[PDB]
C-alpha cells in the first residue's frame, strides 16, 4: 500500500517571495509533517502516508526546499538550517497549524531536531529516522569532525559547487538505481571519493534494479530531479559552518517534548551507535530499532517503520 | 480578518482525468468544506475562513467546478448535480477524509443538500445559506416551476449557451460591481430579463462600488473569471431536468444528520419563506436568520454569519 501521485492532494504554500513549498496531504486528525532526506522526495514516504492516515493522522509529506515541485533557488545560503526551519514555521502559520508532529529522515532528520530545539512551541512531538541529535561541539570545527571520520569523505566532495552536480545529473536513471539499494546490494564505498574521481567511478554503468524499488519508482525520481537537478539538494551540505554557528546558540537547552529516535542496523553512514548518548539530553527519549535495514529506511523496512511510528504516535 | 490569496495554502485534487478542483485550506480540527455559489469564488468565504479556523476547524474553501483555478470543461452535462456531487466524494477520498461538514451558499447550498441526501455517510453535518431544501415534485417539471415564479425569469435567460456569457463577459468589472451589492443598493431588474434583451441593459454603465466591497476585492473576481469565463459557472443552471430526474430517485427519504438553514431577510430570489416546511423532511434542523441581509450573505453580514455557524458547529 503506497501512493499514486495523481491520486493525491497537492498543496502549495508561498513561505516567501521567491519560495513556495509543495506537499502532499492525506488523512484527518493531528497533523504529522514528514521530511525526507537527500536525495529523495515526498514520494520516499509512499508507504507511511497511507498507513499513518489510516491510523487516524493528518499527513503532510513535504518536498523539502530544492526538491521536486518546491522552489530551488541557486543560492547556497538558502539551505542552511536556520533559514529552512524559519520557512517550516512560516509554512505552519499559513496553513493555520499551531503545532505539528515532525518526522524526518536523513537531512530531514536533522531539520526536525533543529525545529525541536529552536521552535519547541510549534512541534508537538519529534521523531528522526537514522539521524541522531548530536549537540554542537563549540571547539571542534565542523570541517574537523569529518577529516576525523573516514566515511564522511563524500561530504567534502559535495562542497565544491558544480562537481557533484555534474556527476549526479549525468545519468539520472543510473544515479537513483545506484543509490537506492539495500545495504547488501550496495555498489558504493564512501571511503575514497575525493581522490578516486567521483562517487560512481568504480560502480557499474548499467546497474541492476534493487529489490526495494520498481523501475516505475525510479522513473518518478528521475522526472522529479529533471526540473531542478542536484544543486539545491546538495546545497544542504554546504552550510556546515553556518549550521554549527547557529547550533551553538542552543548549546544549553533541552528537548522536553516527546521524542523518538529510530536506528537502522545497516546504515553504514548514520550508524546506530552515533545516537547512544541521546538520553543524556532527552531523558524521556523513546527508541525503535530496525534489523537488516540500510540507509533508505522507509523503502527498506516500511512495515516495521509504520509499526514503530504508529505505536509511538498513539502513545506520545 | 479576511484573506490574502498568496498567504493561503492552495490544494489541487484531480477527481477525473481532466477535472482538477482547487481549494484553499486553513486550520486544524474537523474538516469543513465551504462551497460558494454563482458567480463567486473560494474568496467569497474570506470572512469565514479565518474565523472558523480560529474557532478550531479545518477549513477547505473550494473553487467549485467551473470557477477560478478549478477545471472548467465546456460540456453542460459536466455541471449537473449528480456529477458535481460524485466529484466532491472523490475529492474526500483523495484527501483521505471519511467525513466533512459541508457548508454551502446559493448553488453551493443546493449541492450540499444533495450531498446530505445521497451521501449522508460522508457528510458529518450540513448547513446552507439562503438556499432551501425543497424536495423534488415528480408531477411538475422544473420549467413549470420557473413560469409560476417570475422572479426566476433570469434563469431562462441563462439557458441558451453563449447568450448570458456575452453580456456577463463584456465588461467584468461592471458585471461584478453590478452584482455584488447590498439589497438597498440594487440596480438589477430580475423580473424582465428576456424582454429587455440583457440583465444589465437598464442599469448604469459605470456603477459605484457597493459599501460591501473594495475595488481590490472586485478586481480579484475579475482576474479569476478571465481564466475560464462564464460558460462553466452558467452551466450550473442548464441541468434542471437532469437534476430533477436525479432528485426524484431519493423517493422521499429524509435527511437525518445535523442540519442548519440560515435565511436572509433581504434576499429577494432565495426568500426566507421558501424554507418554511423543511422540518418535515429534516427532523434535526436548526435555524439561523439574518436581518438586513441580502443575497451575498458572507460579505453583507460576515460577523452574524460567523457567530451562527460557529455556535452551531460547536454544539452539533
H or E stretch including A134?
Answer: none
Question: Could you give the number of structural domains in chain B?
Answer: 1
Residues of B in contact with A124 (CB under 8 A): none
Sign of CA dihedral B67, B72, B76, B82: negative
Distance of CA B157 to the CA centre of its chain: 19
**Residue A191 catalytic?**
no
Cis peptide before A286 (omega within 30 of 0): no
Nearest Cβ partner of B94 from A7, A30, A95? A7
In three-state secondary structure terms, A292 is coil
A2, A3, A5, A9: best to mutate for the B interface, most B CBs within 10 A: A9
Instruction: Give B290→chain A minimum CA distance, Å.
Output: 29
Residues of B in contact with A13 (CB under 8 A): 8-10
Residues of B in contact with A27 (CB under 8 A): 96-97
Using CA atoms, how far apart are residues A73 and A114, in angstroms rounded to an integer? 22
Residues of A in contact with B95 (CB under 8 A): 9, 25-26
Nearest Cβ partner of A11 from B7, B11, B98? B11
The closest alpha carbon to B25, from B44, B42, B41, B37, belongs to B42
A154 is in an annotated binding site: yes
Contact B292, B305 (CB under 8 A): no
Pick the residue from chain A with its C-alpha nearest to B58. Answer: A96
Nearest Cβ partner of B14 from A6, A11, A27? A6
Sign of CA dihedral A211, A214, A215, A221: negative
Which residues form the domain of B174?
Answer: 1-316
Using CA atoms, how far apart are residues B61 and B33, in angstroms rounded to an integer? 6
- For residue A148, the 8-state DSSP code is T
Nearest Cβ partner of B10 from A7, A12, A31? A12
- For residue B4, the 8-state DSSP code is -
Query: Which cell is A275 given?
Result: 545516537
Catalytic-role residue among A106, A153, A267, A300: A106
Contact flag B28-A53 (C-beta cutoff 8 Å)? no
At A4, phi and psi to the nearest 5?
-115, 125
- Structural resolution in Å: 2.6
For B3-6, which contacts have Cβ atoms below 8 Å and span 24 or more sequence positions? B3/B43, B3/B46, B3/B49, B3/B50, B5/B43, B5/B220, B6/A14
Using CA atoms, how far apart are residues B48 and B59, in angstroms rounded to an integer? 9
The closest alpha carbon to B298, from B126, B63, B105, belongs to B105
- For residue B63, the 8-state DSSP code is P
Using CA atoms, how far apart are residues B295 and B305, in angstroms rounded to an integer? 13
**Residue A292 catalytic?**
no
> Which CATH number belongs to the domain containing residue B287 in this structure?
3.40.50.1820
Pick the residue from chain A with its C-alpha nearest to B49. Answer: A96
Nearest Cβ partner of A94 from B9, B14, B58? B9
Contact flag B96-A26 (C-beta cutoff 8 Å)? yes
- Would you tell me how many other CB atoms lie within 10 Å of the CB of residue A13? 25
Using CA atoms, how far apart are residues A113 and A128, in angstroms rounded to an integer? 8
Sign of CA dihedral B294, B165, B110, B17: negative
Pick the residue from chain A with its C-alpha nearest to B32. Answer: A28
Sign of CA dihedral B282, B288, B289, B294: negative
B10, B28, B60: best to mutate for the A interface, most A CBs within 10 A: B28
Phi-psi region of A208 (alpha: psi -120 to 50; beta: other; left: phi over 0): beta
Pick the residue from chain A with its C-alpha nearest to B29. Answer: A29
Catalytically annotated residues of B: 106, 237, 295
- For residue A27, the 8-state DSSP code is -
Catalytic-role residue among A22, A43, A295, A300: A295
Instruction: Give B97→chain A minimum CA distance, Å.
Output: 6
Instruction: Give B31→chain A minimum CA distance, Å.
Output: 8
At A188, phi and psi to the nearest 5?
-130, 135
**In chain B, helix, strand, coil percent, each to 5?**
40, 15, 40
Helical residues (DSSP H) of chain A, grouped into ranges: 48-54, 81-94, 107-118, 142-146, 153-157, 163-168, 172-179, 215-225, 231-235, 240-248, 297-300, 302-315
Residues of A in contact with B9 (CB under 8 A): 11-13, 94-95
Using CA atoms, how far apart are residues B113 and B238, in angstroms rounded to an integer? 19
Contact flag A7-B28 (C-beta cutoff 8 Å)? no
Q: Which residues of A lie closer than 8 Å to B, measured between beta carbons? A: 6-14, 25-28, 30-31, 50, 53, 58, 94-98
Number of H helices, E strands in chain A: 12, 8
Contact flag B12-A10 (C-beta cutoff 8 Å)? yes
Task: Provide the b/e sequence for A101-134 (b: ≥16 CB within 10 Å).
Answer: bbbbbbbbbbbbbbbbbbbbebbbbbbbbbbbbe
Contact B30, B55 (CB under 8 A): no
Contact flag A26-B53 (C-beta cutoff 8 Å)? no
Query: Which cell is B162 given?
Result: 453563449
Task: Provide the b/e sequence for A248-266 (b: ≥16 CB within 10 Å).
Answer: eeeeeeebebbbbbbbbeb
Where are the extended beta strands (E) located within A29-99? 31-35, 58-62
Amino acid at each position: 500500500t503506497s501512493c499514486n501521485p495523481s491520486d493525491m492532494s497537492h498543496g502549495y504554500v508561498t513561505v516567501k517571495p521567491r519560495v513556495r513549498l509543495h506537499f502532499v496531504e492525506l488523512g484527518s486528525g493531528p497533523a504529522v509533517c514528514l521530511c525526507h532526506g537527500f536525495p529523495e522526495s515526498w514520494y520516499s514516504w509512499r508507504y507511511q502516508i497511507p498507513a499513518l492516515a489510516q491510523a487516524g493522522y493528518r499527513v503532510l509529506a513535504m518536498d523539502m526546499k530544492g526538491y521536486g515541485e518546491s522552489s530551488a533557488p541557486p543560492e547556497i545560503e538558502e539551505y542552511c538550517m536556520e533559514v529552512l526551519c524559519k520557512e517550516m514555521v512560516t509554512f505552519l502559520d499559513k496553513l493555520g497549524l499551531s503545532q505539528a508532529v515532525f518526522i524526518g529522515h536523513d537531512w530531514g532528520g536533522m531539520l526536525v531536531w533543529y525545529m525541536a530545539l529552536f521552535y519547541p512551541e510549534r512541534v508537538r512531538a519529534v521523531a528522526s529516522l537514522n539521524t541522531p541529535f548530536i549537540p554542537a561541539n563549540p571547539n571542534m570545527s565542523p570541517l574537523e569532525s569529518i577529516k576525523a571520520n573516514p566515511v564522511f569523505d563524500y561530504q567534502l566532495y559535495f562542497q565544491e559547487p558544480g562537481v557533484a552536480e555534474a556527476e549526479l545529473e549525468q545519468n539520472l536513471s543510473r544515479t537513483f538505481k545506484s543509490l537506492f539499494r539495500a545495504s547488501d546490494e550496495s555498489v558504493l564505498s564512501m571511503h575514497k571519493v575525493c581522490e578516486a574521481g567521483g562517487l560512481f567511478v568504480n560502480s557499474p554503468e548499467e546497474p541492476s534494479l534493487s529489490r526495494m524499488v520498481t523501475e516505475e519508482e525510479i522513473q518518478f525520481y528521475v522526472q522529479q530531479f529533471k526540473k531542478s537537478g542536484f544543486r539545491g539538494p546538495l546545497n544542504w551540505y554546504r552550510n556546515m559552518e553556518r549550521n554549527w554557528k547557529w547550533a551553538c546558540k542552543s548549546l544549553g537547552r533541552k528537548i522536553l517534548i516527546p521524542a523518538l529516535m529510530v536506528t537502522a542496523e545497516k546504515d553504514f553512514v548514520l550508524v546506530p551507535q552515533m545516537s547512544q548518548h541521546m538520553e543524556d539530553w532527552i531523558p524521556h527519549l523513546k527508541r525503535g530499532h530496525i534489523e537488516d535495514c540500510g540507509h533508505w529506511t522507509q523503502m527498506d523496512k516500511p512495515t516495521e517503520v509504520n509499526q514503530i511510528l504508529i505505536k509511538w504516535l498513539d502513545s506520545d
